[PDB]
Amino acid sequence: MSDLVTKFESLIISKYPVSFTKEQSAQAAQWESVLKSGQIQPHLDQLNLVLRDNTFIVSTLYPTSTDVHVFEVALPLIKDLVASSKDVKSTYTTYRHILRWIDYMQNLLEVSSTDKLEIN
Amino acid sequence: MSDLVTKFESLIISKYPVSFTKEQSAQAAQWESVLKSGQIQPHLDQLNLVLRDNTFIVSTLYPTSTDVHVFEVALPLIKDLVASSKDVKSTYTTYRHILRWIDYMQNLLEVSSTDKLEIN
């Protein structure tokens, strides 16, 4: 159990019961396959599109473990993309919805100031 | 209270509670406006399209009062369209989903054999 997963399960929001539809079950299976195959980075625009229309990855009102698993690899990637940008306003536009989600998730999991993404 | 509405409320299916979304509330308002303005007949292809993708008019698992109100005017219209057709197979295709719904509704409300639509 990673530090973020351990932190997530310390919050009661992790205890909110949810009975997945077969659609949501597939969404969770899809991000598991993307994660374990090591392809989160090529699938960032797909993550951004999902999050345009959904508050969380598996079409839920509350963060689930899929959100924590994906945020764990996505935060470092997006932070690096932003730190290295020569036009951070455009980068922000390109990844606008992932950044909304990151902001929520890094506050929920109380990510340290060195590891978090300094936001605007 | 018409004969069909009176019959519907004699069945416990009429008692199944359902809390409408604002989307479903709008769907019900939309068919009320079509009904009361007298425009069901020009809106048959729209009814057929709704029923292609929804089992009942207001996106429910169970018939609601909107279904009974619309079926009351729709059954006579479709029956006449079918009785007068020179190619009943094509008519059946054109209004396929309304005919599925009619079949269910005329069985649920035990419509008399003279008033019902003899089906294939």
Place this chain on the structure above:
Amino acid sequence: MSFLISFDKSKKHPAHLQLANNLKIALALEYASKNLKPEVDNDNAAMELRNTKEPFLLFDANAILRYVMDDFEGQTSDKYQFALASLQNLLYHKELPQQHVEVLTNKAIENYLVELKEPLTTTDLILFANVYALNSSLVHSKFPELPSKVHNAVALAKKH
């Protein structure tokens, strides 16, 4: 059967990735369970499975206005029922029968509309809309200074 499935075919994925994907897609077709046996799409070169059902939409203007106002109140009114069954039915005539319009709109602003108070309800607005379309001179004399929201709407709607 309101689902479209497609193969990875193009995409610059490597040949071995297309194969892995397309074997999986072919196996979904073979092992599909009759009630969820999707239709194949050939002018998509990208692999996906997607629901082809229509999205949420409304075609009736009253329902659209009520939805955007979240205002589903008063549909049982005599006000609203007269709007729908006495006024809105007339709007489907190819040419308006002016003598009937005249009394029915008169009646509307006698019994049902007096006000343009507000807060204006969707029911009020739908009544005003129907009367305006049928007899706006009666409206001009009835309310020569309109609430500015209604005024801005009319200004836009009146030009073709």
Place this chain on the structure above:
Amino acid sequence: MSFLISFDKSKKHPAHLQLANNLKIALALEYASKNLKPEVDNDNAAMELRNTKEPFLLFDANAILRYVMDDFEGQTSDKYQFALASLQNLLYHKELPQQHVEVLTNKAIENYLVELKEPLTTTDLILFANVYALNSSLVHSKFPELPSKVHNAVALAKKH
């Protein structure tokens, strides 16, 4: 704000029907509540309000196959976790590193695949798919007569 609204503009509705409708549409815009203030669409001549969100879709082949089989079982397996993390990762290389493929696929049919029993699970099928794409000669020698469903899938998938 994932909603498009449009005016009745064309449509052969009578002029008075367009007006009634377009006054209602204009009033929805004016009385909209900020959080549901729709965007206007000008290359639709027909009046509607519609949700522009993406429909349900999946882009991952494993998820597509599991969805069409309603088979979400075994994702915690070492079988499946090896499929995903040891085999499927290799499929994203521009050119396959053949010596590694050889042992990892060998291992796959040593520890995890022996069978093509059935009823074949989605987990079994996803493992077979990945191994086939990487090393189908090892498969040919492993199972020279394949379940006919798998056989029909392979026959389709193998041609570009």
